[PDB]
Design a protein around this nucleic acid. Structure first.
Lengths: 197, 138, 172, 137, 190, 52
RNA sequence: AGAACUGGCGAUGCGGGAUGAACCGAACGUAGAGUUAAGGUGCCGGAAUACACGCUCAUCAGACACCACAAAAGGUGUUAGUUCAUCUAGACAGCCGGACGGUGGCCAUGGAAGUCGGAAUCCGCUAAGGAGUGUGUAACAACUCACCGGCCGAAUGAACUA
RNA sequence: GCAGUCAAGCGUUCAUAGCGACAUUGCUUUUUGAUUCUUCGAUGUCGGCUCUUCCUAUCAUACCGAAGCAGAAUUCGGUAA
């Protein structure tokens, strides 16, 4: 229904997301993701950490460099969690991934554009109150990542550039809600009410 | 046994509800053991006081509806640390020795019950000047 | 193991010249179909008397409608059943509207709290009570209070589509 | 100030006399009202003025309303429509914005192309007012 | 059995205020203020009046229930803190080596200091947090006291001082040296 | 030199305790189960040996 | 390793069990269409992030037969149940009122009035009382229990099981 | 080979600090066997030397708990390769 879909991971889960992401990419629906650093995962920080550690050691015994690349950036966590939900040695699986890009936060050419949410994959709906979850940015840096401060820094920048835009827009609509109601009570409008408008 | 002991209490209750034509429901709140005991020796003349569980009291008085039907109105006054001073002497005498003498204020008289009649204890202390205004003005 | 029905089932040992007019036996049985209600009849009649499927006959097989299927009712259930290590009995209660769903709820409970299946479980007795305060559990008494109220928070909007355009709410 | 402060999420409660809204089944979009409560999620409702039968259901397909009226418990269906229209609750529900959108999207469905191209050009003849309106101001 | 509803009641005394929004508690009184976070519980409050508050949970488990009782204590603690203050008394001990104790500032850091614990060379350092105040005793011997409104920081900084003066490589049953809590009370009610 | 009051004050923190036969933790003297998982919140406990 | 009945592999593909000679299903000319099996429906992957009742949080979760493993004995982790007991004649638990007199019961002494310690366990009014379960003074004064009674009003423990 | 359970009993008094009879449940494949499925038109069938890695049922080092631990010395145990 759209050419491109920007998706915020904030409040999301990695598993439930990438599934509904994967089957969209193989159908051509171009995706792109933001605020990957702020994903959530069930279980406490410790289990979601150790499970990385058990994977962290798993390595080609005789030459570590051709073994499992253990990326730590939350981007390439969600990526891997996506790739593993794909037959990714075929070309179908490859073009599926040029259809996708994942970022931390929200770079310029995507920040002034809408981004969305996936109700199937929400902590706040899918996951019960009273269970421990785990942010990813706490973890990626706990296993090699660096730039948690940078994103929190570069993020707070735009959010100021955002709030400008919002309240600049907010009053601009209350302007509309005024100059429209003078026409709301018009015979033109009374017809539209007769037709569902 | 234990319930028979609750029953042992009920006996003296009914014993004095009937053995005495009157009973002064007196407030045993704040009455010390030396104060309740000194209530006896002065009451050893006529009155006998009987203490227990108010729940046992009402549950005792709740069982005397076949005969002694007028005892139904003792239950609303079985409240707080209050108890009956079963007695047969005139009103002002036991009323004064209960409330005035050997009082640490301290027990008052919650209610004076006799022959299905209820008194607020206020006019009971009327010594004089009440009948003169009624007999003269009438 | 379905949406159940309560059947009344009557059978007797097969008559002969020896005993015309045998002694019928009624049972209030729970299942999906009248077929099974004949089966478990013989399953129990065995245990109680010297008979079988073959020396016996059904005299009648009827479904029971519920007498008052909107009257919410506190149902008390004596029960027997079996475990991995032996046989057990119970008395357990539900507040619900029919004897039927009161059991359709039961087997699911038993199949999660003690891991029993229809084959292991026997039902013994099912009773409405005339007066409150005859109850013995608490999660039932939780609902018998005057002027009772309570909320249902964390309303969730199971979406039709996949995507959205709003971090939703749950105020309800 | 000396007065303490608490904000409490005003939630829709469950109770007798609570009106509901059914979402699935033969009663999609209909209204009903509880007579009794069973468990955390099961109930005894009725929709006589609407024609929904006294029954039971989960609270899953049912969404609660901001509306409510006074009602004795367990009161059979005759009492319901009585206490119901005694309060005139559909109209309250009708005056609600909630109901008004349902009737909107429905009319949007039942439309016809000539009505759509009627709508379309109408908005424009409307909308031209708004510009020369919403430029001076 | 999934308790449908359980509640606990809190009292707020006079001259006191309390302000809740998004389960972010503030608590203000004569000592000053107290602020708190409790987003890690999914529970409800209610102001029935400026003099009493209810906390309750609707249709919750058992481990979601106990958290109703504890939250009663915290605001009961914070209330009592900013009103009565909190006060935690210690007592040095030594059978041979007299402990030295001081308070020192590195850029106002207000570090507690310790020396001669069993005559050791090592100097120890415990910081003094905010909201806590210190007083050595004079009417009585070696009864340093800490006090404040935040029982958390206090009993923490207390126990921070207890575990730091712990024995190594010995039988503590004999070597009872250290810095132990004796009594803990308020600033008010004597 | 060192007095029983401070001693008993020390006993509450250093001796008046209890221990598990397995989890070997220094536990409250009134406790009934161990506060450790690896042993399994067991109930085999003892009092710490009062010195001499 | 060796026997019995029957069925299969060898001699036989096919769908599934990821893989797998014997398991489940089913046996086959070449094609098309329809329905089903056994198995399954988050993605890999075709199919319901379908509905519904419940249990589970694991600092080492578990996740379907043949099958690629686990036991003893334990757990105030959690749920359900059983058996026994206290309590509306008012219990528990929490709070509250007396904690009296013969009476500071007898020895121990600078002083020990129910509480360092040695020896008796009795009596009155009693709803009740231990000749006291315990705090504090140099010793009184000044309290909480035993026991009993005013408060809400009905829950609470013990051993068991799965 | 290795680790558990129970507790008669030692451990001056005490079953369990350390010990642990009478029994009992199990693990590992570094012992030896058992069987012979591969391989007899083919696996170069002891040991040492050099060299890397891996496990833990840890011998030392780091942090800790308990003791029939006064200190020193030791013993039991825990995390940990």
């Amino acid at each position: 229904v759209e050419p491109v879909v920007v998706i915020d991971g904030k409040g999301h889960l990695v598993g439930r997301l990438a599934s509904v992401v994967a089957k969209q990419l193989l159908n051509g629906q171009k995706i792109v993701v933001v605020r990957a650093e702020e994903l959530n995962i069930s279980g406490e920080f410790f289990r979601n950490k150790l499970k990385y550690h058990d994977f962290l050691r798993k390595a080609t015994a005789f030459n570590k460099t051709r073994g499992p690349f253990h990326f730590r950036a939350p981007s390439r966590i969600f990526y891997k969690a996506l790739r593993g939900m794909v037959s990714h040695k075929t070309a179908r699986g490859k073009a599926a991934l040029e259809r996708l890009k994942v970022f931390e936060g929200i770079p310029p050419p995507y920040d002034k554009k809408k981004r969305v949410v996936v109700p199937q994959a929400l902590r706040v709906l899918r996951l019960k109150p009273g269970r421990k979850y785990t942010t990813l940015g706490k973890l990626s840096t706990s296993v090699g990542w660096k730039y948690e401060d940078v994103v929190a820094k570069l993020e707070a920048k735009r959010k100021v550039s955002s709030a400008e835009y919002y309240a600049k827009k907010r009053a601009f609509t209350k302007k509309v809600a005024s100059a429209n109601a003078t026409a709301a009570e018009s015979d033109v409008a009374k017809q539209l009410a007769a037709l569902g408008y | 046994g234990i319930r028979e002991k609750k029953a042992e209490y009920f006996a003296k209750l009914r014993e004095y509800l009937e053995e005495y034509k009157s009973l002064f429901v007196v407030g045993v709140d704040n009455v010390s053991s030396q104060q309740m005991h000194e209530v006896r020796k002065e009451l050893r003349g006529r009155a006998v006081v009987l203490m227990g569980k108010n729940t046992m009291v009402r549950r005792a008085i709740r069982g005397f509806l076949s005969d002694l039907p007028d005892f139904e109105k003792l239950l609303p006054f079985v409240k707080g640390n209050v108890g009956f001073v079963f007695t047969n002497e005139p009103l002002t005498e036991i009323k004064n020795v209960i409330v005035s003498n050997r009082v640490a204020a301290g027990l008052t008289v919650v209610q004076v019950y006799d022959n299905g009649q209820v008194f607020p204890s206020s006019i009971l202390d009327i010594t004089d000047e009440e009948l003169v205004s009624h007999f003269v003005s009438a | 193991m379905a949406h159940f029905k309560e059947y009344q089932v009557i059978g007797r040992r097969l008559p002969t010249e020896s005993v015309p007019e045998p002694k019928l036996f009624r049972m209030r049985i729970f299942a999906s179909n009248e077929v099974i209600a004949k089966s478990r009849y013989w399953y129990f009649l065995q245990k109680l008397h010297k008979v079988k499927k073959a020396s016996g006959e059904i005299v009648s097989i009827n479904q029971i409608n519920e007498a008052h299927p909107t009257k919410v009712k506190n149902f008390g259930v004596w029960v027997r059943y079996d475990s991995r290590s032996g046989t057990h009995n119970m008395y357990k209660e539900i507040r619900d509207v029919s004897r039927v769903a009161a059991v359709e709820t039961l087997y699911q409970d038993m199949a999660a709290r003690h891991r029993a299946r229809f084959r292991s479980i026997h039902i013994l007795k099912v009773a409405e009570i005339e007066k409150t305060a005859d109850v013995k559990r608490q999660y039932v008494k939780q609902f018998l209070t005057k002027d009772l109220k309570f909320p249902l928070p964390h309303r969730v909007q199971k979406s039709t589509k996949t995507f959205s355009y709003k971090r939703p709410s749950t105020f309800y | 100030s000396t007065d303490s402060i608490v904000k409490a999420s005003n939630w829709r409660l469950v109770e007798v006399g609570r009106v509901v809204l059914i979402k699935k089944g033969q009663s999609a979009g209909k209204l009903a009202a509880i007579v009794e409560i069973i468990d955390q999620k099961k109930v005894l409702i009725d929709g006589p003025k609407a024609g929904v039968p006294r029954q039971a259901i989960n609270l899953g397909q049912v969404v609660l309303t901001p509306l409510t009226f006074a009602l004795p418990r367990g009161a059979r269906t005759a009492t319901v429509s009585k206490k119901w229209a005694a309060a005139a609750v559909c109209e309250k529900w009708a005056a609600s914005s909630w109901a008004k959108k349902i009737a909107q999207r429905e009319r949007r469905a039942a439309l016809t192309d000539f009505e759509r191209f009627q709508v379309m050009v109408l908005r424009k003849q409307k909308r031209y007012t708004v510009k020369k309106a919403l430029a001076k101001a | 059995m999934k308790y449908i509803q359980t509640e606990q009641q809190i009292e707020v005394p006079e001259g006191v205020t309390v302000s809740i929004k998004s389960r972010i508690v503030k608590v203000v009184g004569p000592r000053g203020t107290l602020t708190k976070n409790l987003k890690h519980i999914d529970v409800t409050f209610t102001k029935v009046n400026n003099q009493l508050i209810k906390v309750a949970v609707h249709n919750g488990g058992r481990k979601h229930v106990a958290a109703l009782r504890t939250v009663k204590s915290l605001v009961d603690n914070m209330i009592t803190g900013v009103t009565k203050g909190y006060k935690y008394k210690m007592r040095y001990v030594y059978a041979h080596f007299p402990i030295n104790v001081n308070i020192v500032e590195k850029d106002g850091a207000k570090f507690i200091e310790v020396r001669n614990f069993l005559g050791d060379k090592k100097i120890r350092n415990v910081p003094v947090r905010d909201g806590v105040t210190i007083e050595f005793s004079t009417n009585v011997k070696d009864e340093i006291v800490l006090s404040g409104n935040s029982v958390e920081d206090v009993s923490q900084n207390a126990a921070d001082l207890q575990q730091i003066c712990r024995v190594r490589n010995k039988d503590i049953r004999k070597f009872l040296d250290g810095i132990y809590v004796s009594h803990k009370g308020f600033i008010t009610e004597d | 030199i060192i007095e029983p009051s401070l001693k008993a004050l020390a006993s509450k923190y250093n001796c008046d305790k209890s221990v598990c036969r397995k989890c070997y933790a220094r536990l409250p003297p009134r406790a009934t189960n161990c506060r450790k998982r690896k042993c399994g919140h067991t109930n085999q406990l003892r009092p710490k040996k009062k010195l001499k």
